[PDB]
Design a protein around this ligand. Structure first.
Ligand SMILES: [Zn+2]
Lengths: 96, 195
């Protein structure tokens, strides 16, 4: 399904598994490092050892996670980059 | 008084790309992005700017500065930044340096996507500007550009720079802009005449 990532207090990659996101609090993103499941808003505060503590972070809202989680850079252009992009928009638009 | 409230100069690494874009007072908000409009009234578009020195690696960063930032002037000359990009924007401002809690120019501020932060206060600038001015006045012995750093904003578009990153100075980032607030620049030219 979805190859996902974020660059918050470090960076992290994961797997969005659409079929599991069936409630605002449903851990549906799985870290591609610890392999654990994360609810979209907790996944955004989960970087692995990537730290980034000598830079001041302004406006980080965990609730603003729909602006943080992005589609992997794994550009296979064609209509998969667009198809999966449209499915990522659907995930975002659902419990708001 | 200021015909324009600020003028913006774009850079890719240490080369200035395009002509310095001047923002008119009739325009409080201005957008800096990477798309179409090769002209620009309240839109400084970077997507159609040439640069012989541009490298494939720089082109890659330009594709990520999507909707870019929005620079907003409030009141007499206070500035705010709105990150419309999918990627955070890194700013350099003495205002934040303080508000944050750190020493003068000793912090890089990561402004997150969709965030809307105030990055410059005119008064705090005018006060602080008089301070260091009189401070230098006090250098007695016997037998100025340091002041315009306070009236300036530097911000990087997709790549941070500092202790936490592979880049030492903003001039190593693929695409950033330098902002001269004119109103604050006047006060500078006033704190000296009036001094
Ligand atoms: Zn993990």
């Amino acid at each position: 399904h979805m190859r996902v990532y974020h660059e918050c207090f470090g960076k992290c990659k994961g797997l969005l598994v659409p079929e599991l996101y069936s409630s605002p609090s449903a851990a549906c993103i799985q870290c591609l490092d610890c392999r654990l499941m994360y609810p979209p808003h907790k996944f955004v505060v989960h970087s692995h050892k990537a730290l980034e503590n000598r830079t001041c972070h302004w406006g980080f809202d965990s609730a603003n996670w729909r602006a943080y989680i992005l589609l992997s850079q794994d550009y296979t252009g064609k209509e998969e980059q667009a198809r999966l992009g449209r499915c990522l928009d659907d995930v975002k638009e659902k419990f708001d | 008084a200021p015909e324009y409230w600020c003028s913006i100069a774009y850079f890719e690494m240490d080369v200035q790309v395009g002509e310095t874009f001047k923002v008119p007072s009739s325009c409080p908000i201005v957008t800096v992005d990477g798309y179409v409009d090769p002209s620009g009234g309240d839109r400084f578009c970077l997507g159609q700017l040439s640069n012989v020195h541009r490298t494939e690696a720089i082109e890659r960063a330009r594709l990520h500065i999507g909707k870019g930032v929005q620079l907003e002037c409030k009141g007499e000359g206070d500035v705010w930044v709105r990150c419309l990009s999918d990627h955070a924007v890194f700013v350099q401002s003495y205002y934040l340096d303080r508000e944050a809690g750190r020493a003068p120019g000793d912090a890089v501020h990561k402004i997150y996507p969709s965030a809307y932060i105030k990055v410059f206060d005119l008064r705090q600038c005018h006060r602080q500007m008089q301070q260091q001015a009189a401070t230098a006045q006090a250098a007695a012995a016997a037998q100025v550009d340091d002041l315009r750093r306070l009236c300036i904003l530097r911000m990087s578009f997709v790549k941070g720079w500092g202790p936490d990153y592979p880049r030492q100075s903003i001039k190593e980032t693929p695409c950033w802009i330098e902002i001269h607030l004119h109103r604050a620049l006047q006060l500078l030219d006033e704190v000296l005449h009036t001094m």
